[PDB]
Amino acid sequence: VEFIQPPGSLPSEVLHLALPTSCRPWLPALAWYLRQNLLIFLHSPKYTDSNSRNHFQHPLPPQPDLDIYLYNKPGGQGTGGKGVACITLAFVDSLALWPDPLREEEFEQLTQVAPRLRLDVWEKGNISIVQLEEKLRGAARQALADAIIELQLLPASL
Protein backbone atom coordinates (compact mmCIF):
# COMPACT_ATOMS: atom_id res chain seq x y z
CA VAL A 1 0.00 0.00 0.00
CA GLU A 2 2.78 2.44 0.92
CA PHE A 3 4.75 1.53 -2.21
CA ILE A 4 2.34 3.55 -4.37
CA GLN A 5 1.26 5.89 -1.56
CA PRO A 6 3.77 8.66 -0.79
CA PRO A 7 2.73 9.09 2.85
CA GLY A 8 4.50 12.44 3.18
CA SER A 9 3.11 13.95 -0.04
CA LEU A 10 -0.53 12.96 0.40
CA PRO A 11 -2.04 14.39 -2.82
CA SER A 12 -1.28 14.02 -6.52
CA GLU A 13 -2.76 17.48 -7.20
CA VAL A 14 -6.25 18.39 -6.00
CA LEU A 15 -9.61 17.83 -7.68
CA HIS A 16 -12.51 20.09 -6.69
CA LEU A 17 -16.02 19.28 -7.93
CA ALA A 18 -18.66 22.00 -7.74
CA LEU A 19 -22.24 20.92 -7.08
CA PRO A 20 -25.39 23.05 -7.39
CA THR A 21 -26.58 24.58 -4.13
CA SER A 22 -30.07 23.18 -4.78
CA CYS A 23 -28.75 19.74 -3.77
CA ARG A 24 -27.63 21.07 -0.37
CA PRO A 25 -30.71 19.97 1.67
CA TRP A 26 -30.22 16.29 0.71
CA LEU A 27 -26.42 16.23 0.97
CA PRO A 28 -26.03 12.93 2.90
CA ALA A 29 -28.30 10.83 0.68
CA LEU A 30 -26.38 12.01 -2.38
CA ALA A 31 -23.21 10.80 -0.66
CA TRP A 32 -24.66 7.31 -0.31
CA TYR A 33 -25.68 7.41 -3.97
CA LEU A 34 -22.14 8.51 -4.76
CA ARG A 35 -20.79 5.82 -2.43
CA GLN A 36 -22.84 3.47 -4.58
CA ASN A 37 -22.44 4.97 -8.04
CA LEU A 38 -18.65 5.12 -7.76
CA LEU A 39 -18.40 1.35 -7.23
CA ILE A 40 -18.50 0.38 -10.90
CA PHE A 41 -14.82 -0.34 -11.44
CA LEU A 42 -13.68 1.24 -8.17
CA HIS A 43 -12.68 -1.23 -5.48
CA SER A 44 -12.95 -0.93 -1.72
CA PRO A 45 -9.77 0.03 0.20
CA LYS A 46 -9.85 -3.24 2.14
CA TYR A 47 -7.05 -5.80 2.45
CA THR A 48 -5.54 -8.27 4.91
CA ASP A 49 -5.10 -5.37 7.31
CA SER A 50 -6.26 -5.49 10.93
CA ASN A 51 -5.12 -1.88 11.37
CA SER A 52 -5.94 1.50 9.87
CA ARG A 53 -2.23 2.19 9.31
CA ASN A 54 -1.97 -0.86 7.05
CA HIS A 55 -4.93 0.57 5.14
CA PHE A 56 -4.30 3.34 2.63
CA GLN A 57 -3.50 6.74 4.09
CA HIS A 58 -6.53 9.05 4.19
CA PRO A 59 -5.75 12.81 4.19
CA LEU A 60 -9.45 13.57 4.73
CA PRO A 61 -11.02 13.71 8.20
CA PRO A 62 -14.46 12.10 8.55
CA GLN A 63 -17.41 14.46 8.23
CA PRO A 64 -16.38 5.27 12.88
CA ASP A 65 -17.05 5.54 9.14
CA LEU A 66 -15.63 6.75 5.80
CA ASP A 67 -13.20 5.09 3.37
CA ILE A 68 -11.19 5.82 0.23
CA TYR A 69 -11.30 4.97 -3.48
CA LEU A 70 -8.93 2.60 -5.28
CA TYR A 71 -8.50 2.46 -9.06
CA ASN A 72 -6.83 -0.42 -10.88
CA LYS A 73 -4.30 0.32 -13.60
CA PRO A 74 -5.94 0.42 -17.05
CA GLY A 75 -4.26 -0.24 -20.37
CA GLY A 76 -3.50 -3.57 -22.00
CA GLN A 77 -3.06 -3.56 -25.77
CA GLY A 78 -1.37 -0.47 -27.15
CA THR A 79 -1.60 2.30 -24.57
CA GLY A 80 -0.91 1.26 -21.00
CA GLY A 81 0.84 2.09 -17.77
CA LYS A 82 0.98 1.63 -14.02
CA GLY A 83 -1.70 3.59 -12.19
CA VAL A 84 -2.83 3.10 -8.59
CA ALA A 85 -4.05 5.58 -6.00
CA CYS A 86 -6.06 6.08 -2.81
CA ILE A 87 -8.59 8.89 -3.30
CA THR A 88 -10.20 10.13 -0.07
CA LEU A 89 -12.64 12.80 -1.26
CA ALA A 90 -14.95 14.92 0.86
CA PHE A 91 -17.50 17.70 0.44
CA VAL A 92 -16.68 21.16 1.83
CA ASP A 93 -17.25 24.81 0.97
CA SER A 94 -20.09 18.54 6.86
CA LEU A 95 -23.16 16.32 6.54
CA ALA A 96 -23.16 15.13 10.17
CA LEU A 97 -25.50 17.93 11.28
CA TRP A 98 -27.73 17.29 8.25
CA PRO A 99 -30.61 14.85 9.13
CA ASP A 100 -43.03 21.49 -6.24
CA PRO A 101 -41.83 19.82 -9.44
CA LEU A 102 -39.43 21.07 -12.12
CA ARG A 103 -39.81 21.30 -15.88
CA GLU A 104 -38.06 19.40 -18.68
CA GLU A 105 -37.06 22.03 -21.24
CA GLU A 106 -35.43 23.94 -18.36
CA PHE A 107 -33.66 20.77 -17.20
CA GLU A 108 -29.88 20.20 -16.91
CA GLN A 109 -29.70 23.13 -14.50
CA LEU A 110 -29.73 20.81 -11.49
CA THR A 111 -27.52 18.41 -13.48
CA GLN A 112 -24.95 21.12 -14.31
CA VAL A 113 -21.58 20.54 -12.63
CA ALA A 114 -23.02 25.47 -3.01
CA PRO A 115 -20.75 22.80 -1.52
CA ARG A 116 -17.64 21.87 -3.47
CA LEU A 117 -16.32 18.31 -3.62
CA ARG A 118 -12.56 18.19 -3.06
CA LEU A 119 -10.68 15.09 -4.20
CA ASP A 120 -7.06 14.05 -3.70
CA VAL A 121 -5.30 10.79 -4.57
CA TRP A 122 -1.81 9.27 -4.49
CA GLU A 123 -0.93 8.68 -8.14
CA LYS A 124 1.47 5.86 -9.02
CA GLY A 125 2.36 6.81 -12.60
CA ASN A 126 0.40 6.58 -15.84
CA ILE A 127 -3.08 7.71 -14.82
CA SER A 128 -4.38 10.12 -17.53
CA ILE A 129 -5.76 12.50 -14.92
CA VAL A 130 -8.10 14.13 -17.46
CA GLN A 131 -9.90 10.83 -18.08
CA LEU A 132 -10.25 10.21 -14.35
CA GLU A 133 -11.57 13.75 -13.81
CA GLU A 134 -14.21 13.43 -16.53
CA LYS A 135 -15.14 9.98 -15.21
CA LEU A 136 -15.60 11.52 -11.75
CA ARG A 137 -17.76 14.28 -13.22
CA GLY A 138 -19.97 11.80 -15.06
CA ALA A 139 -20.31 9.49 -12.07
CA ALA A 140 -21.21 12.38 -9.78
CA ARG A 141 -23.82 13.61 -12.26
CA GLN A 142 -25.34 10.13 -12.52
CA ALA A 143 -25.42 9.74 -8.73
CA LEU A 144 -27.08 13.14 -8.32
CA ALA A 145 -29.67 12.25 -10.97
CA ASP A 146 -30.39 8.95 -9.21
CA ALA A 147 -30.79 10.74 -5.88
CA ILE A 148 -33.16 13.28 -7.46
CA ILE A 149 -35.32 10.63 -9.14
CA GLU A 150 -35.53 8.81 -5.81
CA LEU A 151 -36.24 11.91 -3.71
CA GLN A 152 -38.94 13.61 -5.70
CA LEU A 153 -40.23 11.56 -8.65
CA LEU A 154 -40.54 8.28 -6.73
CA PRO A 155 -42.90 9.27 -3.85
CA ALA A 156 -45.58 10.49 -6.28
CA SER A 157 -48.58 8.17 -6.52
CA LEU A 158 -50.70 7.46 -9.59
Experimental method: cryo-EM
CA distances for 9 relative to 5, 58, 127, 142, angstroms: 8, 12, 17, 31
**End-to-end C-alpha distance for the chain, whole angstroms:** 52
Task: Tell the burial category of 63 from Cβ atoms under 10 Å away from its Cβ (0-12, 13-18, 19+).
Answer: middle
- C-alpha torsion angle, residues 20, 23, 28, 32 (rounded to 10): -80
* Helix (H), strand (E) at residue 93: none
Q: What is the resolution of this structure in A?
A: 3.2
- DSSP output for 61-91: --------EE------SSS------EE--EE
In angstroms, the CA 86 to CA 100 distance is: 40
